[PDB]
A paper describes a structure:
Herein, we report 30 X-ray structures from a structure genomics pipeline spanning 13 years, representing 10.2% of the X-ray structures for this important pathogen. This project ultimately involved 335 proteins linked with pathogenesis, metabolism, and antimicrobial resistance.
The structures presented here are part of the C. difficile 630, R20291, and Y384 sets nominated at CSBID.
Author numbering: 292 to 461, 470 to 533, 543 to 561
Write the structure that this text describes.
Amino acid sequence: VSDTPKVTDTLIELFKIDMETQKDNPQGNASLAGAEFTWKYYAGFYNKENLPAEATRTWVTKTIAETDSDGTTHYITKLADAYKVSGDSFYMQDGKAVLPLGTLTVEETKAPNGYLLDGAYMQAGDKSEQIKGLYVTQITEDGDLAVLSGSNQFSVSDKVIRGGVKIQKRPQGSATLKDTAFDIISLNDNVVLVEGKLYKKNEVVKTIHTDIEGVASTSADLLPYGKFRIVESEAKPIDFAITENGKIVDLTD
């Protein structure tokens, strides 16, 4: 027979994954670790449409890599000290973070390095509803207990940053009018999805040819955040990075 308000330690675990591959691994040299989530607890019972302007407590947590007993690394965040970035103190009971009756909201507020926030969504299981933006649930009474409504686990899908690259070969037009082919190679420790196909380190992900101006170019979404090597396909190679979304890296000097 306790003497403290009704609370539950059964909260929510978020698993960060790559949206395009649906894998527990980042693409290129991006990360699934470091994604930040803002959690807000409210003393009342609200829905998304009538949340008060001020939360009762606010916490910012981040995804951290964890390898399970099967040897699989996941990128997990939840309401505990090991995942905390900033915010108020947690409600603690018997060495664990708990929540009293009320409303709980959570949304991704910082994409992990190499990813975008744009379009990120949560999923409780396979085929279930894709939740975009702010997720809202409550801690409600069930007999003498406090219970969190809805799923206890979600996958959080993040869109990887993508970019492109353009280049030239090194009379008049005797160099630019030649048919110069360039191979683009992955220098990444993780797979890269390029034109519907997965490529590993040192594999050629694309070949591009020079136009009548002498410029070989890719689309602005060909390559995920990552390190790449561009070399004439016959030969002095160039290493470059994709970091800004939709930007064509300019190697034409």
